[PDB]
């Protein structure tokens, strides 16, 4: 799929939000990620992020020399576009 | 099966997590059109969702996200 770094990531997620507002679904998916990359060397300090709408998909891979700078700035863009809702 | 509490989804859902590290899936469903928000933890042997429609929701979300994150990464 189309493999983008995180600041990439973030804009192309923040576009999908965006085209997911009055019809469409946003997935997003987040999973351990060893490092393959041939069929059935592992690494153990990556974790793997794919958004989706349905037509058009990214991925992610984020590391522990990131993780710092990538997890605030996903929480903010999370708030900044999963409005929407009751206050109570 | 789905749960209406945040706290036990949660707890029950970073157990699942350490139980098979490799196995463990995170799904995040987000419908705008529809004003709904959708949790599945899975690990296609048990699986955990919750669903909400409350605002308050969003930054436990984003919280549960960053730890298993954290988690992930780490050794």
Redesign the interface.
Not at chain 1, 82 to 88: A, E, F, N, V
């Given at each position: 799929m189309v493999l983008l770094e995180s600041e990439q990531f973030l804009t192309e997620l923040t576009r999908l939000?965006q085209k997911?507002?009055?019809?469409?679904?946003?997935?997003?998916?987040?999973?351990?990620?060893?490092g393959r990359t041939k069929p059935i060397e592992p690494a153990?300090?990556?974790?793997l992020l794919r958004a989706t709408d349905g037509k058009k998909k990214i991925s992610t891979v984020?590391?522990?020399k990131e993780?710092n700078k990538?997890?605030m700035a996903?929480?903010n863009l999370?708030?900044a576009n999963?409005?929407?809702?009751?206050?109570? | 099966p789905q749960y209406q509490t945040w706290e036990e989804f949660s707890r029950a859902a970073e157990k699942l997590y350490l139980a098979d590290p490799m196995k463990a899936r995170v799904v995040l469903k987000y419908r705008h059109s529809d004003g709904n928000l959708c949790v599945k933890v899975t690990d296609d042997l048990v699986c955990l969702v919750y669903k909400t429609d409350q605002a308050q929701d969003v930054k436990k979300i984003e919280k549960f996200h960053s730890q298993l994150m954290r988690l992930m990464v780490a050794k």
């Open positions: 939000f997911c507002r009055t019809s469409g679904s946003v997935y997003i998916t987040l999973k351990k990620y060893d153990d300090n990556k974790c984020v590391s522990s993780v990538f997890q996903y929480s999370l708030r999963m409005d929407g809702l009751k206050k109570r | -």
